[PDB]
Design an enzyme around this catalytic site. Sequence first.
Site, short mmCIF file in Angstrom:
data_model
loop_
_atom_site.label_atom_id
_atom_site.label_comp_id
_atom_site.label_asym_id
_atom_site.label_seq_id
_atom_site.Cartn_x
_atom_site.Cartn_y
_atom_site.Cartn_z
CD1 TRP A 196 -7.02 9.05 -1.83
CD2 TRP A 196 -7.96 9.44 0.17
NE1 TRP A 196 -6.04 9.53 -0.99
CE2 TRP A 196 -6.59 9.78 0.25
CE3 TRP A 196 -8.76 9.61 1.32
CZ2 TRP A 196 -6.00 10.25 1.42
CZ3 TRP A 196 -8.17 10.09 2.49
CH2 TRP A 196 -6.80 10.41 2.52
NE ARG A 253 2.59 0.57 3.54
CZ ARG A 253 3.76 -0.03 3.69
NH1 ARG A 253 4.09 -0.55 4.87
NH2 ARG A 253 4.60 -0.10 2.66
CB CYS A 259 -0.95 0.02 1.21
SG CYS A 259 -1.90 1.54 1.32
CD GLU A 264 -5.93 2.18 -6.61
OE1 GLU A 264 -6.26 1.06 -6.14
OE2 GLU A 264 -6.09 3.28 -5.99
C1 HEM Z 1 -6.12 6.56 1.84
C2 HEM Z 1 -6.13 6.23 0.55
C3 HEM Z 1 -5.42 5.03 0.04
C4 HEM Z 1 -4.75 4.96 -1.14
C5 HEM Z 1 -4.61 6.10 -2.13
C6 HEM Z 1 -4.24 3.64 -1.27
C7 HEM Z 1 -3.51 3.21 -2.40
C8 HEM Z 1 -3.31 1.86 -2.64
C9 HEM Z 1 -2.97 1.30 -3.90
C10 HEM Z 1 -2.83 2.09 -5.19
C11 HEM Z 1 -2.83 -0.05 -3.76
C12 HEM Z 1 -2.49 -1.03 -4.87
C13 HEM Z 1 -3.77 -1.70 -5.38
C14 HEM Z 1 -3.60 -2.52 -6.65
O1 HEM Z 1 -2.65 -2.31 -7.47
O2 HEM Z 1 -4.43 -3.43 -6.89
C15 HEM Z 1 -3.07 -0.34 -2.39
C16 HEM Z 1 -2.95 -1.61 -1.88
C17 HEM Z 1 -3.40 -1.87 -0.61
N1 HEM Z 1 -3.92 -0.99 0.30
FE1 HEM Z 1 -4.04 0.91 0.19
N2 HEM Z 1 -4.60 2.90 -0.20
C18 HEM Z 1 -5.29 3.68 0.66
C19 HEM Z 1 -5.91 3.35 1.88
C20 HEM Z 1 -5.91 2.05 2.41
C21 HEM Z 1 -6.59 1.63 3.57
C22 HEM Z 1 -7.51 2.49 4.41
C23 HEM Z 1 -6.26 0.29 3.81
C24 HEM Z 1 -6.74 -0.60 4.90
C25 HEM Z 1 -7.10 -0.16 6.13
C26 HEM Z 1 -5.38 -0.10 2.74
C27 HEM Z 1 -4.83 -1.35 2.60
C28 HEM Z 1 -4.24 -1.74 1.39
C29 HEM Z 1 -3.93 -3.16 1.15
C30 HEM Z 1 -4.15 -4.33 2.09
C31 HEM Z 1 -3.42 -3.25 -0.09
C32 HEM Z 1 -2.93 -4.53 -0.77
C33 HEM Z 1 -4.04 -5.39 -1.39
C34 HEM Z 1 -3.48 -6.63 -2.07
O3 HEM Z 1 -2.51 -7.31 -1.63
O4 HEM Z 1 -4.05 -6.99 -3.13
N3 HEM Z 1 -5.17 1.01 1.94
N4 HEM Z 1 -3.35 0.83 -1.70
C1 LIG Z 2 -8.88 -8.84 -7.40
N1 LIG Z 2 -7.73 -7.90 -7.53
C2 LIG Z 2 -6.63 -8.21 -6.57
C3 LIG Z 2 -6.99 -7.83 -5.14
C4 LIG Z 2 -7.46 -8.82 -4.27
C5 LIG Z 2 -7.81 -8.50 -2.96
C6 LIG Z 2 -7.67 -7.18 -2.52
C7 LIG Z 2 -7.20 -6.17 -3.37
O1 LIG Z 2 -7.09 -4.87 -2.90
C8 LIG Z 2 -6.46 -3.84 -3.68
C9 LIG Z 2 -6.66 -2.56 -2.90
C10 LIG Z 2 -6.82 -2.61 -1.52
C11 LIG Z 2 -7.00 -1.44 -0.79
C12 LIG Z 2 -7.04 -0.22 -1.44
C13 LIG Z 2 -7.24 0.96 -0.73
C14 LIG Z 2 -7.27 2.16 -1.44
C15 LIG Z 2 -7.09 2.16 -2.83
N2 LIG Z 2 -7.10 3.33 -3.55
N3 LIG Z 2 -6.90 1.00 -3.49
C16 LIG Z 2 -6.89 -0.18 -2.83
C17 LIG Z 2 -6.70 -1.34 -3.56
C18 LIG Z 2 -6.86 -6.50 -4.70
CL LIG Z 3 -10.38 -0.84 -8.18
#
Ligand code: HEM
Ligand SMILES: CNCc1cccc(OCc2ccc3ccc(N)nc3c2)c1
Ligand SMILES: [Cl-]
Lengths: 361, 361
Positions: free
Chosen positions: A236, A67, A64, A241
């Site tokens: 957000w 963070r 993420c 994305e």
């Molecule tokens: C505040 C705005 C946030 C932005 C802009 C953001 C941005 C991102 C982005 C761009 C990804 C990559 C997603 C992808 O390529 O599929 C990501 C992954 C992730 N984010 Fe964030 N995020 C935010 C908030 C959060 C929050 C609130 C949480 C949980 C409390 C979170 C947990 C995660 C997790 C777990 C992943 C990995 C998912 C996976 O392994 O597929 N994020 N985030």
């Molecule tokens: C099915 N696509 C892969 C896959 C599987 C399970 C979770 C996941 O989460 C991606 C993800 C998780 C959290 C996010 C929070 C904010 C954000 N802008 N994107 C976010 C994108 C992505």
């Molecule tokens: Cl999405």
Amino acid sequence: EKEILWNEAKAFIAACYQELGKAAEVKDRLADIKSEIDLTGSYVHTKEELEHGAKMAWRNSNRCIGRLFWNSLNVIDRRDVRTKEEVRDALFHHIETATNNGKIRPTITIFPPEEKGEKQVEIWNHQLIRYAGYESDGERIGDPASCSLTAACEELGWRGERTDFDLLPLIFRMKGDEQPVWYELPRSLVIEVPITHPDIEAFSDLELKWYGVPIISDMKLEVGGIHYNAAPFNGWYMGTEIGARNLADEKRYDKLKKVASVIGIAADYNTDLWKDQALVELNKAVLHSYKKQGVSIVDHHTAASQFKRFEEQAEEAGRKLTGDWTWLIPPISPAATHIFHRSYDNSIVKPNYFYQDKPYE
Amino acid sequence: EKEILWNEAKAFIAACYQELGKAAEVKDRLADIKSEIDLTGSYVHTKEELEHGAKMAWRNSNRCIGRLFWNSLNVIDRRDVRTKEEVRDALFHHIETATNNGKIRPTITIFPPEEKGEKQVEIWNHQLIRYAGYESDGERIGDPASCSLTAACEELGWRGERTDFDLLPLIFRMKGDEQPVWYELPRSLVIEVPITHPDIEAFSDLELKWYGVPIISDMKLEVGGIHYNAAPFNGWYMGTEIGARNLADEKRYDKLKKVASVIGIAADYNTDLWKDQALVELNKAVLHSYKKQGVSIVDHHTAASQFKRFEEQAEEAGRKLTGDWTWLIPPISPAATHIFHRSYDNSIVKPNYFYQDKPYE
Ligand code: HEM
Ligand SMILES: CNCc1cccc(OCc2ccc3ccc(N)nc3c2)c1
Ligand SMILES: [Cl-]
Ligand code: HEM
Ligand SMILES: CNCc1cccc(OCc2ccc3ccc(N)nc3c2)c1
Ligand SMILES: C[C@H](O)[C@H](O)[C@H]1CNc2nc(N)[nH]c(=O)c2N1
Ligand SMILES: C[C@H](O)[C@H](O)[C@H]1CNc2nc(N)[nH]c(=O)c2N1
Ligand SMILES: [Cl-]
């Protein structure tokens, strides 16, 4: 089993209470937990623990980029729910409060955790708001990533209109029920953003749109050995994305050729870099459109600058930084970010969010 | 030591001769080698072995997207050189033949290998053709990546003109000499390409240029336990190396702000994605300019399509594919390539090219 739980509990409580300035309260809290496990097989987090664990879990999410804001996560404790109407209403409420009229609040709603590995609530949706996808003979409609869930919903009596942007219903299953239930989303709850371009009038001919808030609802939150398999959360969007993946990937909406046409460039030669140019204009359009509508969004450069501050903050706090370089780099101009030029330790630290098996497919 | 060498020799000869259809010749060749080591401490590759090993080494280079063409590598055997005039002339010849009037031939020139770990020839240049870089009080001129080699050349009596594009001299050291020698590059040997843009006339105001052929001269080729520390090789450029890195990186030529100005867009807001747009136009300019001058170059999409064929060819041949995903993805629109969407085994297979310590710094 109690062993695994007790160990994870000791590690979590010590770390949690230390960060909260409550180190002196550990011994007694550990005692009560030690007893609670023996007598019950599990233990219940205090509201403080649960809120802080959800925040730690976000902080430890290697993939993420967002963070920096981990400590301001809005944590809604819904461990009290027992009925599918309560779960439905909690999911509706999460959408409304997170959306917050466009000024998105990062929020997580936490449902009762697994007991004996037995789920109390099982959410089928990947995100609470997502578009359906269809693939019959030749015909490709909507979001291909949604084809299998869409087909499962239609097995349960739901029917999509077969536009490219049908909202999937909420779908989840209660412990003790054989089948999930589904509930149509009230359109009043769902903000969508039409995609227009700041300079190119014709861009609206594409009739693209996307929803305002990504609410990921199929991951498991683990905190101190407690498995919250149902705990939807949202931030957000980062613009890429939507613009570089959801709307651009060949296996998603696959819009680059159509973008190239409306922006008035040929899509005939790789050396023209028409895909790259199409990507940049589509991504400008996405950011512009969200901003114009007053829906929160971040661009990948600002996001990376924020992540640099998260790195600095980690160091200053004395915490190891972990990260997954392959997911942290944006899919547009990654070498223009600092992320590209350093490496990250991809170790897994708990609390954290995890993948879990789908119940369809 | 003989052990290490003999083992690597057995593994290499068996694999090499098998690929060359000469499996029946292994036993006897291994015998002669076994004897040669015992009596001499080392062994000499036949011309066939050396040529095929250099090709295998390219094939096994995990970070290289251009591997489809591994088997057509032009291998020049210069193990006969004994004097610095011979080394100089071999380096000049490599430049001329690889350049081939713009129709670049991937070529490697192989010098005598290390003996007792003792180098026979030590090349100081990172590439045979590269620009100098200067950094004194406030003043930043040329290529920052070249600052330490530039300062070392100037310690040896070379003096750069202090343009942004001074060609570094060839600089290398012979076994037995305490200091390297340096030789100015004849300008007639060095093709350079002025950067213009197909549509934007003002782009020439930037007065950008780059050299035609990247000839990496500071890696070690290892083949069957023999260490060829001096073995410069070249391909043709992929456009993003020049447009997205050499000319764009903040720590290299740092030209994006100036590109943004000449293409007529503001460089004030991250949400405008002006860096991304500048990158795309600069990269279009680079490809256009090389093509217009008749100097070989590949764009990152064509390159990735070729690499997909290399993957397919590997499978069809029965060879494991290895790769470094973090280096294989292009720094522009990586998610538009297939590379982004799969993973690669980053194992190291020999023969291969390796990093070695600089003798300056
Ligand atoms: C505040 C705005 C946030 C932005 C802009 C953001 C941005 C991102 C982005 C761009 C990804 C990559 C997603 C992808 O390529 O599929 C990501 C992954 C992730 N984010 Fe964030 N995020 C935010 C908030 C959060 C929050 C609130 C949480 C949980 C409390 C979170 C947990 C995660 C997790 C777990 C992943 C990995 C998912 C996976 O392994 O597929 N994020 N985030
Ligand atoms: C099915 N696509 C892969 C896959 C599987 C399970 C979770 C996941 O989460 C991606 C993800 C998780 C959290 C996010 C929070 C904010 C954000 N802008 N994107 C976010 C994108 C992505
Ligand atoms: Cl999405
Ligand atoms: C034919 C044209 C070729 C193209 C277009 C090409 C493309 C590339 C690119 C873009 C990189 C990444 C460089 C970077 O980001 O710094 C690379 C790495 C590499 N290429 Fe190739 N290449 C070609 C030919 C060759 C040849 C002929 C060899 C050797 C015989 C070779 C060996 C390598 C090696 C060893 C690396 C990794 C260097 C490192 O670890 O720093 N390539 N190639
Ligand atoms: C000093 N920069 C890192 C570093 C150190 C040592 C070798 C190297 O080589 C990069 C490299 C190697 C071979 C190439 C062949 C063709 C090509 N277009 N680029 C190529 C780029 C790069
Ligand atoms: C160490 C860090 O990951 C570094 O920036 C790498 C990333 N990927 C790369 N990829 C390529 N092709 N070239 C590079 O120089 C780098 N640098
Ligand atoms: C498995 C393969 O590396 C895959 O394409 C990854 C690469 N990096 C990524 N990075 C982000 N942010 N999101 C993704 O979905 C992926 N996919
Ligand atoms: Cl280069």
